[PDB]
């Protein structure tokens, strides 16, 4: 089947940076859009941004754009979520999802297991 393998949990000190990985299995990301969603203990989900591994174009949420950086390495079929200067507010679970662009319509079906990031 298709699968989105995510890296392990993280515990960083306020001010440090962090890189999260979302490796794809069963499909080449060069044909899917890699999105990133953040979820705090609250419950509500929040879109952070996406990227096009093919062209390298990105798309962030205005509130995240100045903190998150989504990178992609086709050579390794991996997408990254770089978070800078962490604060308590950054403590959450970060999932990675995909969307096939080469098709009429396709929702955000497959998702990664989500990697927890605790700062405090």
């Amino acid at each position: 089947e298709v699968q989105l393998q995510q890296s392990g949990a993280e515990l960083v000190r306020p001010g440090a940076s962090v890189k999260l990985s979302c490796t794809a299995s069963g499909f080449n990301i060069k044909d899917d859009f890699m999105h990133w969603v953040k979820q705090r203990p609250e419950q509500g989900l929040e879109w952070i941004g996406r990227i096009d591994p093919a062209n390298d174009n990105t798309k962030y949420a205005p509130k995240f754009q100045d903190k998150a950086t989504i990178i992609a390495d086709t050579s390794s079929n991996t997408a990254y979520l770089q978070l800078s200067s962490l604060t308590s507010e950054d403590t959450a679970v970060y999932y990675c999802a995909r969307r096939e662009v080469y098709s009429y319509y396709s929702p955000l079906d497959v998702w990664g297991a989500g990697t927890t990031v605790t700062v405090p």
């Binding site: 419950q43 319509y105 079906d109 998702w111």
Partner: protein
């Protein structure tokens, strides 16, 4: 931009019982070009990743049971389940899949 509002937030249910959830969008999600509404529903159990239940506000994902019915148009949508089961106790989110940025509702948690 597009605000997703779901209600009620919490809902005590009993097995076999029918349940109705509502999700209202800030602006219309109906694409006049294909008459399809870009709204999708999710299910989330604790310690588990979000799962796709329905997209285009009413089309069931390959796999989900019929007891999951989504409907509504443009601004108002609702989720329904005829005779809720036990493994139906998660949180359900509706999501605007029309335009950027993608927005999710706060969700409705089904309780014991």
């Amino acid at each position: 931009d597009i605000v997703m509002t779901q209600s009620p937030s919490s809902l005590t249910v009993t097995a076999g019982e029918k349940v109705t959830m509502s999700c209202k969008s800030s602006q219309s999600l109906l694409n006049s070009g294909n008459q399809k509404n870009y709204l999708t529903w999710y299910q989330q159990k604790p310690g588990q990743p979000p799962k796709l239940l329905i997209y285009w506000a009413s089309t069931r994902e390959s796999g989900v049971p019929d007891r999951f019915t989504g409907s509504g148009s443009g601004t108002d949508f609702t989720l329904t389940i005829s005779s809720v089961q036990a493994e139906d106790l998660a949180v359900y989110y509706c999501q605007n899949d029309y335009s950027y940025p993608l927005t999710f509702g706060a969700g409705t948690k089904l309780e014991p």
